[PDB]
């Protein structure tokens, strides 16, 4: 009676990814943001390899596979970053990468202090709720299937079945090692609330990156190849209401 599903998620979990930032140089808006964009491109490559290895993922239509990756990367990366911050610096700072750790001073220099405050808060939730490594892994996987277009995907049916199974697994991690049914229901309630709080944060970051892309030539900020294309084509659909997140609560 081994955790086949959990074994897989643990086995495919990406490793450490550096941004290539030079902490030796004085912090400047352009340098910090250029480093974040580069980190995004690097983690994006890792999110693709991780996703392809997820149970059932290759069952979706190829066009849908690219759609969920293009729409949910922000949320996925913010959630993982929140976990890294918690486990590494106990949510004291934002652990984007080993060579890119944000303190209060960098949060201000990046011109996105408010958004950083919410990310730090999410990170603190991992501690306040005592989120376990297993629960973390399952929630992150579910985040890949939490945002889609209102007009539906090419094969909406396969997607619905896939998302339904992942919610079921999360239920399994909570159900097991817990006799009291009231505590199970309470736990599911708390975790679904946690997952929903990720969406508002991702939207604010979407708006911010989109605006920066438009005026990137003025602030001397560079956007990688894939990043610039996703933000100019996919992100706008999110901001115009064409693509929306799936919330458990209202």
């Amino acid at each position: 009676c081994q955790p086949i599903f959990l074994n897989v998620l643990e086995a495919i979990e990406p490793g450490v990814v550096c941004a290539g930032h030079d902490n030796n140089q004085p912090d400047s808006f352009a340098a910090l943001l250029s480093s974040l964009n580069e980190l995004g491109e690097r983690q994006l490559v890792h999110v693709v390899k991780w996703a392809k290895a997820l149970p059932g993922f290759r069952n979706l239509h190829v066009d849908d596979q690219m759609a969920v990756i293009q729409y949910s990367w922000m949320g996925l990366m913010v959630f993982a970053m929140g976990w890294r911050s918690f486990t590494n610096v106990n949510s004291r700072m934002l652990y984007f990468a080993p060579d890119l750790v944000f303190n209060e001073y960098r949060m201000h220099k990046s011109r996105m202090y408010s958004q950083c405050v919410r990310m730090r808060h999410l990170s603190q939730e991992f501690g306040w709720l005592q989120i376990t490594p297993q629960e973390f892994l399952c929630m992150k996987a579910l985040l890949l299937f939490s945002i889609i277009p209102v007009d539906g995907l090419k094969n909406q049916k396969f997607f619905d079945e896939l998302r339904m199974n992942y919610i079921k697994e999360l239920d399994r991690i909570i159900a097991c090692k817990r006799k009291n049914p009231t505590s199970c229901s309470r736990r599911f309630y708390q975790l679904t609330k946690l997952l929903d709080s990720v969406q508002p944060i991702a939207r604010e970051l979407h708006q911010f990156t989109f605006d920066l892309l438009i005026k990137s030539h003025m602030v001397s900020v560079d956007f990688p190849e894939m990043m610039a294309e996703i933000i100019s084509v996919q992100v706008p659909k999110i901001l115009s209401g064409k693509v929306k997140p799936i919330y458990f609560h209202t």
């Binding site: 066009d63 294309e229 996703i230």
Partner: peptide, 14 residues
């Protein structure tokens, strides 16, 4: 697909 690079990353074996 549209995002040529991304599309390549998906169908490429690693």
């Amino acid at each position: 697909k549209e995002n040529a690079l991304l599309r390549y990353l998906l169908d490429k074996d690693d």
